[PDB]
Design a protein around this ligand. Structure first.
Ligand SMILES: Nc1ccn([C@H]2C[C@H](O)[C@@H](COP(=O)(O)OP(=O)(O)OP(=O)(O)O)O2)c(=O)n1
Ligand SMILES: Nc1ccn([C@H]2C[C@H](O)[C@@H](COP(=O)(O)OP(=O)(O)OP(=O)(O)O)O2)c(=O)n1
Ligand SMILES: *CC[C@H](OP(*)(=O)O)[C@H](O)COP(=O)(O)O
Ligand SMILES: [Ca+2]
Ligand SMILES: [Ca+2]
Ligand SMILES: [Ca+2]
Length: 326
DNA sequence: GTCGG
DNA sequence: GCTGATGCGC
DNA sequence: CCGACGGCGCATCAGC
């Protein structure tokens, strides 16, 4: 990729700040800078050139000058060599181990994959599943497998109730040739912002997918959000497909557009769009767009009849899902 | 770490 | 049990 | 310089 050296440097810094320093605003600053540089259509020749971009300040310009002159960054060189950093950066790759749990495990002398497998009794349900499928969850999902997965989920949901609509969102809906996981937005007319006329609406879909051995494990489950594990069926004598992460979010049917905007992302696109909405005097979540009073108190939800209406309120030209990726 | 007031 | 904080997730 | 930085679901735990 153009400027791939710089954007990789910035992503490594972002992850260090998140996982090791526990500094969420530096994590987000580095990612916002990586994303703006990834879209810049020239090979960056200096830090001064990069610093012209919004989200690139003095300190990133200085690291770009070091990286362009030497091909490395001394700060990352040191982070790679530091045992506590290295240990924490590894443990946080396990689903369910965040920065706080990683540091606590390193304190207890639990620092390698072999230490985790010796200590399953010290992991919660989520972490145990994270560890079981550590390699599988590393692997990306080809679009060809995502289409197979779509066909199973859409067909099994129709078997439960023809009135469900299931939409595959995330990087898949942005047209990606591969996905990190599957994200399914679910609506049913019985669940609106005015009423739940039927219990178990998410549960009955989870149950059906478990029944046909598509959903294999559960990391977390409530009334509106499932987070778990799924797997494609394989043929006679064939190697099994890797286990995959799946998220299902049940959104009130009348708030589909806000919900599909949220679930389509990217996450960096959502942060950028929601920060732009605040500048314009609105707040966006997965349900509504609301004005802000001078007070900073959100007013009543605004009428939304398309994704594009949300862009119109905040005076952005529409971006098709494919133009919302980094 | 960066930006805008 | 409930409520609010925090961790980890989307 | 300095306040703000997106917004929210589920799991877990402390205090009552
Ligand atoms: N911090 C986050 C994480 C995610 N999301 C939203 C936008 C994402 O598009 C969607 C699903 O999140 P994923 O982490 O599954 O991301 P993607 O599907 O975009 O990418 P990948 O290909 O890695 O799954 O949820 C968000 O708004 N804020
Ligand atoms: N041990 C510490 C360190 C810092 N602080 C507070 C004081 C400041 O509000 C901020 C950090 O102060 P610094 O010395 O880092 O620099 P400032 O930015 O406060 O300096 P100035 O006010 O000159 O900008 O956190 C604190 O209460 N206790
Ligand atoms: C990258 C340089 C750092 O920018 P931020 O406020 O995280 C600072 O200049 C501190 O330098 P460090 O000694 O590299 O952390
Ligand atoms: Ca995804
Ligand atoms: Ca996901
Ligand atoms: Ca949200």
């Amino acid at each position: 990729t153009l400027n791939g050296g710089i954007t990789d440097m910035l992503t490594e810094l972002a992850n260090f700040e998140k996982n090791v320093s526990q500094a969420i605003h530096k994590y987000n600053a580095y990612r916002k800078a990586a994303s703006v540089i990834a879209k810049y259509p020239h090979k960056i020749k200096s830090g001064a050139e990069a610093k012209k971009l919004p989200g690139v300040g003095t300190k990133i310009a200085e690291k770009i000058d070091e990286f362009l002159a030497t091909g490395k960054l001394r700060k990352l060189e040191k982070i790679r060599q530091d045992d506590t950093s290295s240990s924490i950066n590894f443990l946080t790759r396990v689903s369910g181990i965040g920065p706080s749990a990683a540091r606590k495990f390193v304190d207890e002398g639990i620092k390698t994959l072999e230490d985790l497998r010796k200590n399953e009794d010290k992991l919660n349900h989520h972490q145990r599943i994270g560890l079981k499928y550590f390699g599988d969850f590393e692997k990306r999902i080809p679009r060809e497998e995502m289409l197979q997965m779509q066909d199973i989920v859409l067909n099994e949901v129709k078997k439960v109730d023809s009135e469900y609509i299931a939409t595959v969102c995330g990087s898949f809906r942005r047209g990606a040739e591969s996905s990190g996981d599957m994200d399914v937005l679910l609506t049913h007319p019985s669940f609106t912002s005015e009423s739940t006329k039927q219990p178990k609406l998410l549960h009955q879909v989870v149950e059906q997918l478990q029944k046909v051995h598509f959903i294999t494990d559960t990391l977390s489950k409530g009334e509106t959000k499932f987070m778990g594990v799924c797997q494609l069926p394989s043929k006679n004598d064939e190697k099994e497909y890797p286990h995959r992460r799946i998220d299902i979010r049940l959104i009130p049917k009348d708030q589909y557009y806000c919900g599909v905007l949220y679930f389509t992302g990217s996450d960096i696109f959502n942060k950028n769009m929601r920060a732009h909405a605040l500048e314009k005097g609105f707040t966006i979540n997965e349900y509504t767009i609301r004005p802000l009073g001078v007070t900073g108190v959100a007013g009543e939800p605004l009428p939304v009849d398309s994704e594009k209406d949300i862009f119109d309120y905040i005076q952005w030209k529409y971006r098709e899902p494919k133009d919302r990726s980094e």
